[PDB]
Design a protein around this ligand. Structure first.
Ligand SMILES: [Mg+2]
Ligand SMILES: [Mg+2]
Length: 296
């Protein structure tokens, strides 16, 4: 398992944030076409256990998830027993509903440790594209640290997928930024944004986040030598369409208000295996991103 191989890179009451597209069960079996992954490795009982194990390994204070189609039967009750408050917001027209024997819609989930934070406000945002209501969503919550009293905003999203939706993703991202501008009262409140943006760093939506007056940096850039380059991948798998290896996942943070203390490194080509992800020992086609933050 990758959790025995991946290390925290030392980059400096810390707040640990975990970002993960966990792979919806209905999509893994019905839409993704993982041609080199054993079908037995895609079974829900096996996947469920590995996803929980990942969360237990990294002990996050905040967990931001995409492609969650087992929130009500699994993640909400189990994480509640471990002290996490959860919020779930489904895609209005989830692709999971196209799959036989699905478990309902997928969507975003946001969990936080109740004993660490008080919930100040919350918003379930249906993203718009130049006012067009889209099929993608975000959750944004303002939390208050119970030890320091410091407030901050955490948001999670999953943007429109696939080639041909670059301008659409850009419009979505712009709407999200506008919403966060309002919630954080014009960057008065520190911000962390987790997501599968379905976009590599060359896309306009990435450039919008990097140039926003919210003054956001991308945390996993700090793994690079000069701190100026995004990782080579956050997802790596083989589909009927071909092998996909790219960077689509990000943790954005207020550069002037938050410091990154650590980041969980990626797997090497040798460690990940020729058949890539998911596998018998890893439940998603995306690696989890995990960072420790501290207030400046
Ligand atoms: Mg997926
Ligand atoms: Mg709106």
């Amino acid at each position: 398992p990758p959790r025995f191989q991946r290390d925290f890179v030392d980059l400096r009451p810390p707040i640990r944030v975990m970002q993960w597209n966990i792979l919806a069960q209905a999509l893994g079996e019905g839409k993704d076409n993982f041609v080199q992954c054993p079908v037995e490795a895609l079974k829900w009982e096996e996947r469920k256990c590995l996803i929980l194990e990942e969360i237990l390994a990294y002990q996050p204070d905040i967990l931001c998830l995409q492609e969650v189609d087992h929130y009500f039967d699994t993640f909400q009750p189990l994480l509640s027993r471990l002290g996490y408050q959860g919020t779930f917001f489904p895609k209005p027209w989830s692709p999971c509903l196209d799959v036989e024997h699905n478990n309902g819609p997928d969507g975003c989930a946001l969990f936080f440790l109740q004993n660490r934070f008080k919930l100040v406000n919350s918003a379930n945002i249906r993203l718009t594209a130049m006012t067009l209501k889209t099929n993608q969503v975000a959750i944004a919550q303002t939390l208050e640290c119970k030890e320091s009293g410091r407030q901050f905003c955490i948001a999670v999203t999953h943007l429109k997928a696939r080639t041909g939706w670059e301008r659409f993703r850009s419009a979505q991202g712009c709407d999200l930024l506008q919403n966060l501008q309002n919630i954080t009262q014009g960057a008065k409140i520190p911000l962390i944004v987790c997501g599968d943006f379905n976009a590599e760093p060359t896309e306009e939506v990435y450039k919008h986040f990097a140039s926003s007056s919210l003054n956001l940096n991308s945390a996993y850039k700090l793994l690079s030598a000069d701190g100026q380059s995004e990782p080579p991948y956050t997802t790596w798998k083989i589909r009927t369409s071909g092998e996909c290896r790219h960077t689509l996942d990000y943790i954005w943070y207020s550069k002037h208000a938050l410091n990154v203390r650590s980041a969980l490194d990626l797997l090497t080509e040798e460690q990940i295996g020729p058949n890539r992800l998911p596998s018998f020992n890893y439940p998603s086609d995306h690696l989890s991103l995990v960072c420790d933050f501290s207030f400046t």
